[PDB]
Structure 1
Amino acid sequence: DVYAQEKQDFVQHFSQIVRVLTEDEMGHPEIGDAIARLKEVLEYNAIGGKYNRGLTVVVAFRELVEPRKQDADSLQRAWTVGWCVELLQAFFLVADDIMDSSLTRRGQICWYQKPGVGLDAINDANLLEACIYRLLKLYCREQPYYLNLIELFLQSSYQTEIGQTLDLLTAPQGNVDLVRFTEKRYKSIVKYKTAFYSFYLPIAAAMYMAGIDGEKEHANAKKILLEMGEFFQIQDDYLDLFGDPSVTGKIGTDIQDNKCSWLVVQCLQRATPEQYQILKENYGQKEAEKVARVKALYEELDLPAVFLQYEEDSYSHIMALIEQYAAPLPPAVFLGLARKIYK
């Protein structure tokens, strides 16, 4: 597996990242306490995932750049840009867990729930964002793709924040209106809140680093990747309720939080007016017994089977898109990633 090959060198580079970020303290000991906090935030929130987004930069880089140009220094930059993608995710997740009133992430208590942290986590999240641009300046400032990467990270952040806005507006607390929950609304939410930053960003970053800056090549890569991103968020929604928290590392809140989940959208398409009534009375509430009623209804409608069928249809569709849109990039770049999220 090409991801497993690269993983150990990638994960080890995190020590170099922590080191260069905390060497700001060298020439300014007055900010020592702040740098110690930054280190703690990095170690708690950036470590412990599967690193699929960051590894995707490294894997794609190795398949897009001639082996003769994969010197030690170029590899260091690739690992760094990979870690920047992981830091962007950590920024979004720390804030997301506050806004979604979540309990655990990656098997441990959410950062904001940690005693002594609380809403100070807002500033911690913004520091994670700032670290991205410090790392890009330190490692990539002299490279011809520097400005392209800065603009890519900024644009991806904007798109993701627009998506979070749609997510939050469609799920007002204490206000259950099921008519908002359409398939058309759902697809817009997930394209912006997840697809750009999770799938387009890491491959696009590798493309720029390899000198592939063509409008056309980026457009074709988007066609494949935004569809993969849609599937990924559908899977995330399914696992919120039907996944095992010991595997997922997080407790689900979509029902309690009144979210426009793929599950509720599918339920609404299949529900009798009597099932619709059950949904309306129990959705968007914290009571455990009410959450249980919605899950029972989902099982009654065999939504787990609908998801399995969607996974298969989606895989076939993404493979057809790869056949059409991959060239001139090697199909392996997209196939490797697909194997990672569908398997």
Structure 2
Amino acid sequence: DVYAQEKQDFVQHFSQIVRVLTEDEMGHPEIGDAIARLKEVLEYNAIGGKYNRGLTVVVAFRELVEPRKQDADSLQRAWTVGWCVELLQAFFLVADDIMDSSLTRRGQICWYQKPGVGLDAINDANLLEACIYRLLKLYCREQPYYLNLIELFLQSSYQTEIGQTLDLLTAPQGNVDLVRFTEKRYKSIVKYKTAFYSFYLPIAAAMYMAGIDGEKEHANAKKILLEMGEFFQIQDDYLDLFGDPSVTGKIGTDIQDNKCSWLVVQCLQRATPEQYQILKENYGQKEAEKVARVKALYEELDLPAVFLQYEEDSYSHIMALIEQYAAPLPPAVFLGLARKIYK
């Protein structure tokens, strides 16, 4: 297990990441209390997830860079850039939890819900974002792929924020409007809000650190990764309700949160005037009774089988995509990810 094993080396590097970020506090004792708050923000929000995005950078790096060019320093940079992706993720989650008024994250109370934090979490989120560029400058300033990485992280933030904008417009809190839950909107939200930074960013970062800055190579990798990103979110949506909490480790809340889920989009394409009514009067509700009604309608429309068939077609398509666009990159780079997400 490239992940399960390399995971230990990644997480252990975090302590060094924090140290380096809270080091400028030296020659500037004036901002000491600010640096202390930053450390607290980092420890609370960058730790606790699965680190799949960051680990992907490392895994892809090792497979893309010849073993003789994998010096202690090159690997040092790999872990750092990987942690940068985790900081981007933390920047997003802290801000997103505020915007949808979530109560918990990773099973723990949302950072902004903490007593004494509140809306100050908005500035905390921005600090997480800024740490990304601080780390890149500190570890890759002299590297030839420095500018490429800066532009990639900036582009990934923009794409994601654009996707968040689409999502906010699509599912306005306190206003259930199933009318805008179209398949085209859903695919656009997934592509911009999730796919780009979760699947393309990590590999693309590793590609640049390996010297693979070709626009065509990046365009081909993106073609594959965005499709995998699309499947990931669709499977994530499906599991949110039909998944086993004992295996998933979480309880679904998409229905209650009136999210533009793949399930609701598919349910809206197969629903009849009467079914639609039930969905319109039960979606976005917290009462278990109303949620159960939604889930009942989904099963009736046999959405679970629809997804089963979708996963099989998606997998075949991804293999074909890999078979066609992987080269000159080692197929393993993509196959490794596919094996992980296709459960």
Take 1:73 and 1:242, find their aligned partners in 2: how far apart are those partners?
45
Which stretch of structure 1 is more off in the superposition, 112-121 or 330-339? 112-121
Which stretch of structure 1 is more off in the superposition, 178-187 or 325-334? 178-187
Deviation at 1:245, TM superposition (A): 5.0
Pair 1:106–1:248, CA change in 2 (3 A): farther
Which stretch of structure 1 is more off in the superposition, 114-123 or 315-324? 114-123
Which stretch of structure 1 is more off in the superposition, 276-285 or 161-170? 276-285
Q: Confirm or deny: 8 A CA contact 2:285 2:291 kept in the other structure.
A: yes
Deviation at 1:131, TM superposition (A): 0.5
**Contiguous gaps of at least 5 residues in structure 1:** none
Q: Confirm or deny: 8 A CA contact 1:190 1:230 kept in the other structure.
A: yes
Q: Confirm or deny: 8 A CA contact 2:163 2:192 kept in the other structure.
A: yes
Cα deviation digits, residues 265-285 of structure 1 (max 9, x gap): 010111121111101112233
TM-score scaled by structure 1?
0.96
Take 2:242 and 2:24, find their aligned partners in 1: how far apart are those partners?
45
**Contiguous gaps of at least 5 residues in structure 2:** none
Q: Confirm or deny: 8 A CA contact 1:100 1:253 kept in the other structure.
A: no
Identity within the alignment, %: 100
Take 1:119 and 1:246, find their aligned partners in 2: how far apart are those partners?
34
Cα deviation digits, residues 162-220 of structure 1 (max 9, x gap): 00011110012333322211111111111000000000000000111111111110110
Which stretch of structure 1 is more off in the superposition, 90-99 or 241-250? 241-250
Pair 1:305–1:334, CA change in 2 (3 A): same
TM-score scaled by structure 2?
0.96
Take 2:287 and 2:204, find their aligned partners in 1: how far apart are those partners?
43
Take 1:211 and 1:303, find their aligned partners in 2: how far apart are those partners?
44
Cα deviation digits, residues 236-269 of structure 1 (max 9, x gap): 2223333355654555432233221101001011
Take 2:251 and 2:133, find their aligned partners in 1: how far apart are those partners?
32
Take 2:250 and 2:101, find their aligned partners in 1: how far apart are those partners?
12
**Secondary structure in 2 aligned to 1:299?**
helix
Which stretch of structure 1 is more off in the superposition, 276-285 or 58-67? 276-285
Take 2:203 and 2:84, find their aligned partners in 1: how far apart are those partners?
13
Q: Confirm or deny: 8 A CA contact 1:108 1:249 kept in the other structure.
A: no
Greater RCO (Cα-Cα under 8 Å, separation 6 or more): 1
Pair 1:248–1:128, CA change in 2 (3 A): farther
Q: Confirm or deny: 8 A CA contact 2:90 2:128 kept in the other structure.
A: yes
Which stretch of structure 1 is more off in the superposition, 76-85 or 305-314? 305-314
Cα deviation digits, residues 285-337 of structure 1 (max 9, x gap): 34443223212222332322322222222111111110011000000000011
Take 1:116 and 1:241, find their aligned partners in 2: how far apart are those partners?
34
Residue 250 of structure 2 corresponds to 250
Take 2:333 and 2:79, find their aligned partners in 1: how far apart are those partners?
17
